[PDB]
Design a protein around this ligand. Structure first.
Ligand SMILES: [Zn+2]
Ligand SMILES: [Zn+2]
Length: 218
């Protein structure tokens, strides 16, 4: 349960295992989760943060702690909490992976564009760490993807998946509340044995988070 914070408390990292940490940052207090993957080829993040200021501080914190460079980031949809640090990634030579749809939504909303290199299912490998990206369909947004670590049976649900303490769906202005249930069932069908589920906001849980989200959709 190792947790490491910055001075202000606005950024922390919590270890899930030897090589996998959750990163959490507070936007102004509104927390957002992503992952830090400690691989033999460098650090890989799932999602950046709310803005360039937090993204820079997050990168500098993990580079110092883990003593390697952030080389890659997976952006799970085109909202500020996920893509807000894209300028920083691009100017530092950090590869920002996304689906084609996320990239064009980024451009549409005036953000710099991530790579658009992810397909519906993409299998990546960073050093010895295997990473699968999966587009399950529309939900929280039209473009939301989930990230699976097959060596750990860890799912990063992103904002597609609500934490136990969430009592509503959050901001639904860009959401597809009919499709969202089917998209969650697609995740449950694909990943039948889940060890941990990381929601976009709130505490890490298990498969029960996906069932909770279905309940919130009723
Ligand atoms: Zn969002
Ligand atoms: Zn969210």
């Amino acid at each position: 349960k190792t947790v490491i914070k910055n001075e202000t408390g606005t950024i922390s990292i919590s270890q899930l295992n030897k090589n996998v940490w959750v990163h959490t940052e507070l936007g102004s207090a509104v927390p957002s989760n992503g992952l830090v993957l400690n691989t033999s080829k460098g650090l890989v993040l799932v999602d950046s943060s709310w803005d360039d200021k937090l993204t820079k501080e997050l990168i500098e914190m993990v580079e110092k702690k883990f003593q390697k460079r952030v080389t890659d980031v997976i952006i799970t949809h085109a909202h500020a909490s996920r893509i807000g640090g894209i300028k920083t990634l691009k100017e530092r030579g950090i590869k920002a992976h996304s689906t084609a749809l996320t990239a064009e939504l980024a451009k549409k909303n005036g953000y710099e564009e991530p790579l658009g290199d992810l397909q519906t299912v993409t299998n990546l490998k960073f050093g010895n760490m295997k990473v699968e990206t999966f587009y399950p369909g529309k939900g929280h947004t039209e473009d939301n993807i989930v990230v699976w670590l097959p060596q750990y049976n860890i799912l990063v649900g992103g904002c597609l998946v609500k934490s136990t303490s969430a009592k509503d769906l959050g901001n639904v202005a860009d959401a597809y509340v009919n499709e969202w249930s089917t998209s969650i069932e697609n995740v449950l069908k694909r990943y039948r044995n889940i060890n941990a589920v990381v929601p976009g906001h709130g505490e890490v849980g298990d498969k029960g988070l996906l069932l909770h989200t279905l309940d919130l959709l009723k």
